[PDB]
Amino acid sequence: PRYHLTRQVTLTDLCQPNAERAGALLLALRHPTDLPHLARHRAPPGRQTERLAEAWGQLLEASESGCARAGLVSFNFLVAACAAAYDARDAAEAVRAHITTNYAGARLDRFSECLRAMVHTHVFPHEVMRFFGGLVSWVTQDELASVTAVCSGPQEATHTGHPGRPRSAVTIPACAFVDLDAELCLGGPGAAFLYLVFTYRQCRDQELCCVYVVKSQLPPRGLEAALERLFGRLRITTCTYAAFAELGVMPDDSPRCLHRTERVGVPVVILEGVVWRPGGWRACA
Amino acid sequence: CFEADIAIPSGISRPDAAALQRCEGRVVFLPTIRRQLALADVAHESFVSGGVSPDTLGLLLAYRRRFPAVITRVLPTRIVACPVDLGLTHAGTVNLRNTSPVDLCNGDPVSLVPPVFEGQATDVRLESLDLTLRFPVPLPTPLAREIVARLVARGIRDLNPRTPGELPDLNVLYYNGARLSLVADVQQLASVNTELRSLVLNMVYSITEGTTLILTLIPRLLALSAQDGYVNALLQMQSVTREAAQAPMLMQDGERRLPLYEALVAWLAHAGQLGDILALAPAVRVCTFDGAAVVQSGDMAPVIRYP
Amino acid sequence: CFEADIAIPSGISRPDAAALQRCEGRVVFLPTIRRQLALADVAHESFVSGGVSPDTLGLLLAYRRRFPAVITRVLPTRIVACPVDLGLTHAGTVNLRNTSPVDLCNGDPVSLVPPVFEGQATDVRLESLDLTLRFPVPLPTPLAREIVARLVARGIRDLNPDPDLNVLYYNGARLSLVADVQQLASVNTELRSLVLNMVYSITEGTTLILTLIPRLLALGYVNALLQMQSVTREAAQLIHPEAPMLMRRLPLYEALVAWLAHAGQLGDILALAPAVRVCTFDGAAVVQSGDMAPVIRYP
Amino acid sequence: HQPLIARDGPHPVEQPVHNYMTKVIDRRALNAAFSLATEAIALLTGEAL
Amino acid sequence: SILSTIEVASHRRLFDFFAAVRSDENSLY
């Protein structure tokens, strides 16, 4: 009834919502204790199936099940994680400077080795880490993080956007100029859809990752017309690159911005007025 | 709902105001998400691309990247519409007007089709401002997927006209009886080619390394249609599979890779969802509160969200 | 919530009064959304359509047809159940009853068919009025779409016999799918309906394009772009199927329509669309089997 | 109590029953409705006058 | 008094539209 709330107790090895902002696209970490088994299948046996067991085993070594299963990869954490991956330098080192000063970069290097290894053994980081919400509060202890991070569609950014104007409320930072690929260059006035897009390419730049957002007044069923375009990475030859899940709707087209204010100079985008229509992933070819 | 107002521009002829009075519950294709819009961007002149108007395949191609909305209220200066793709978040259950020869059901998923029958023209005329409004035809999703497959193969007949000039129709549809006639007029090349490419593309990705294991079981089916009644109706009379029998090849990479299990999901992901790539996506589900089990041709149906 | 009231029939036995109490939180498929509903309309005998009790094919048609409903409160002479598909998105939090997988903090459960597990499990049968309630199984979408392709693969090995497919390890779960003693004789005979579709529409799908592409690309942009993607991937298996098997436009074009509708139905029959979502608050977010989970409306 | 007739004869003294008959109620609903439009809610309430 | 009936009618449903439809403790004006 245009109001909902979430709350989950996780650890501070990942996102660490103290150094993060009030606006944070918290993704999950779906099933860490999984993938010795499905990493073995869903791939040819000439893919070295023990790789996600070891590289994530190094990532858990970089810091048992505990009283909190490993969750909450931020959207901050992924920008540095593919910073060497997408073809953009000096705009990607700033967010990595935001993490190695305020979040240990060993947790980045073990994770980027997993990002190559996830696409190596064909078990992609999508259908992993579903969207979680918008981080209203962080009541975090020394080891824990009990974040109220409301899911459930349109109201989650309006309940953090109606009282936003006074002081500092959510504002939902896109957190990179290279990310938030704001589409409709050939565009006019209308309410746009937000998506969460992961592009892929097998053995070109060695199972490459790119983590960013697109903004379009295009349907998710017509987005594949544009997602098949706009890329040079159509030359795998197997398949299933360019996954996307709908982040929802931006019903204020003028409200996209360009700024550089965070924490370390981190280039950023204010996104005023968001529907968080949570959607699902869509990856076939 | 995100109520979208469509401005009724200039004058209005006294029957042209009544033209909008009978359209409460039809479907507006609007090529944006607006809170304010003028009427000419909706009309069939706005469907017209560079130079030509689209044919019955290109209309779906126009309808694909154009967002459906339903007329909810009728005012002489505005037409308050509700965008189904977004604003279907209702405890209000926006109604739909059946404009078809077809009783749907209570609960069938409903998608939209252009006017493609001989008597269901539905193109209204406005003498004040010369606009045509071909309203789409809300139809059940087994019926719509049975329509679109007819036009595609007829367009492939328009590619290569070998045999002499006595072809079968692909102009005859049956739905609970009811020999329905389509409109077979003109087939535009690009509207064929864009629809032809996706069908050939999607069926190639439906064959994986473990797919040819299923091809081994072709004489297994023909033994079953000789001694089972369910199989006999399943292998139809005009089937190419019955003509096909007129092959394991182990070659096992690793010998544990789940060879069937990848061939099913990939077939389910690629050639299974042919109804989403040829036609529009289903979003309309018939939800009758008072206990009506059917929705007659010309009646109203309260509508809830995705199937 | 517009909670539609299912009417209990007239007086039942005292164990039948206690049995319907422990169904508080199961999934119920109501055909119409009248505020007064009988209980025989709810029961599995109302799913009898072709003069037979249906298989998992006939259930998935019926489950893709009528409207889901979670039992809210069980009352004397009444069942108060609010349906899922009415209401706006993410309103009306209510409880599901878990079944053996975990159902984490999100995951979008699917009310999918009861015979995916042991055959006469959860079949609440009232001895008094003599009906049957077969409650469906609420599993999440990647665990839904995996298993429903996993069981149809197993029937192929039984359809013509000579690795065990049924492992499917989850995050904490070693999913024992095999009920070998008496259920695999009864679960395999119920996918007899669903397998023969899945075999046919593949073999009608592959063998159509195996005689389409030799008869096409021979009379423009179709030839350029499609072969641009299938450079020695599908062409490698084109020479493989045409040689290690057998090889008329008008039978083919009349078979083009017939497969595509039938292949189109399996996209709605299978693939298990997310009905509802889990999104928890003030909760431990990792749900035990047999524990109530807060569950909200739209994907 | 059912009508009895005092009976003669060499028969066994036939079995006498004088009981309370139990019966089964049915429940019937008799549903009825009436619509009320989008007017007469802004009206009748002072909301639109 | 067309003007004085106009302004007072606005001043009524301004306050009675926000929160005054429910009866209060005892006296409201």
From Swiss-Prot, chain D:
Signal peptide: none annotated. It comes from Human herpesvirus 2 (strain HG52) (HHV-2). This is Major capsid protein. Self-assembles to form an icosahedral capsid with a T=16 symmetry, about 200 nm in diameter, and consisting of 150 hexons and 12 pentons (total of 162 capsomers). Hexons form the edges and faces of the capsid and are each composed of six MCP molecules. In contrast, one penton is found at each of the 12 vertices. Eleven of the pentons are MCP pentamers, while the last vertex is occupied by the portal complex. Homomultimer. Makes the hexons and eleven out of twelve pentons. Interacts with triplex proteins 1/TRX1 and 2/TRX2; adjacent capsomers are linked together in groups of three by triplexes, heterotrimeric complexes composed of one molecule of TRX1 and two molecules of TRX2. Interacts with scaffold protein; this interaction allows efficient MCP transport to the host nucleus. Interacts with capsid vertex component 2/CVC2. Interacts with the small capsomere-interacting protein/SCP. Belongs to the herpesviridae major capsid protein family. The chain holds residues 100 to 148 of 1374 of the full protein. It is found in: Virion; Host nucleus.
